[PDB]
Amino acid sequence: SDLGKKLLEAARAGQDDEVRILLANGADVNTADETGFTPLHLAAWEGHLGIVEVLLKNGADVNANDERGHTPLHLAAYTGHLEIVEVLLKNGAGVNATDVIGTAPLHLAAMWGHLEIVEVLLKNGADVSAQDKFGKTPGDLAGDNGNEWIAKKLLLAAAREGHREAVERAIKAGADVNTADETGFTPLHLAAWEGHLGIVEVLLKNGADVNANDERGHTPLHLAAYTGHLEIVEVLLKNGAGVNATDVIGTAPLHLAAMWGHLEIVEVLLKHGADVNAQDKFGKTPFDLAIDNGNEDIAEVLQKAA
């Protein structure tokens, strides 16, 4: 096992050239010392991007467990090397790998304040509601530690993915219910777009702006009529959400509801009192967009109202 101890000292030191000589000689790429660290762990700790790509292309397991239950992704979120976190994820690493306590890479990335590391985990399907042994969520790890900006980015991912439990606790921690992302989507937009009704009423009960606009003037009432979730449009209109509100292109929720074929939504929009006369920037009424699309039932229902 002399080739493995010199491989661990070469992968930790950063001499990538000695790794090439020893791997071509037949050294095990997944040799574990007394602690269980594979060369992929030590290279992800010291931050040598060159050695990691060599170990991953010859057959190093991307989910190598040490004695403490740390995968190379767990050590990649703790050090803060953004370039190393995405290389492991593209090879098929565990986005929600647990620790001895149950700590996932989403927990460690939000604990030390690595925002760009937290953002890449959320793209690869990370569970924000993942719980460890003590009952602390990355939303709790972010709001208590003092990283309120990371708590906003974590609250937004929870409303988009659909984890209802990890939301009200962050509001109890002082999180902003009207916080927006890069495009302006509040958690009210993300909850009505994916069709997860459970946050729509509880976020509405705390005091979220129902007629809030994004960077392009899109209110959450527009998104509810687009996907066709009728049970969400009824709750939004119950509180007095703007039904005649349009975006920068003049697109009303009636324009979106008539394009995709949602008869039960078009009726409830006409129930609260919406004008068919509204047009977009192309001079197109909800009647004309339903004719070319291939959906005549909506065109006939508004024709009876016109």
Numbering used by the authors: 12 to 317
What did the article's authors report about this structure?
In this paper, we present a strategy to fuse specific, high-affinity protein binders to obtain multivalent or multispecific scaffolds of predetermined geometry. DARPins are used as building blocks to confer the desired specificity to the construct. A series of rigid connector modules replacing the DARPin capping repeats allow to combine the individual DARPin domains in such a way that their distance and angle can be altered to test different geometries, bringing the binding partners of the DARPins into a defined spatial arrangement. The two helices are not just joined end-to-end, but instead the two domains are made to overlap in such a way that the joining helix is stabilized by contacts with the domain cores along its entire length.
In the context of DARPin-β-lactamase fusions, we observed that the paratope of this DARPin has a high propensity to form major crystal contacts, leading to crystal formation under a wide variety of conditions. Indeed, constructs D12_Hxx_D12 with H02, H09, H11, H13 and H15 yielded diffraction-quality crystals in space groups P212121, P6122, P212121, C2 and P1, respectively, at resolutions ranging from 1.8 Å to 3.5 Å. The observed pseudo-torsion angle of 172° is close to the predicted angle of −176°, but the connecting module is partially disordered, such that the C-terminal DARPin is rotated 90° around its long axis. In this orientation, all four D12 units engage in paratope-paratope interactions, where two DARPin domains form an antiparallel dimer. Two such dimers pack into a barrel-like unit. The purple molecule in Fig. 5b shows the C-terminal DARPin packing against the green N-terminal DARPin, the pink molecule the N-terminal DARPin packing against the green C-terminal DARPin. Only a few structures show a kinked, disordered or dissociated shared helix (e.g. D12_H09_D12), but even then the DARPins stay fully intact, demonstrating that local perturbations of the structure in the helix region can be accommodated without unfolding the DARPin moieties. Occasionally, the DARPin fusion constructs would rather distort the conformation of the connector module than forgo the formation of such favorable crystal contacts.
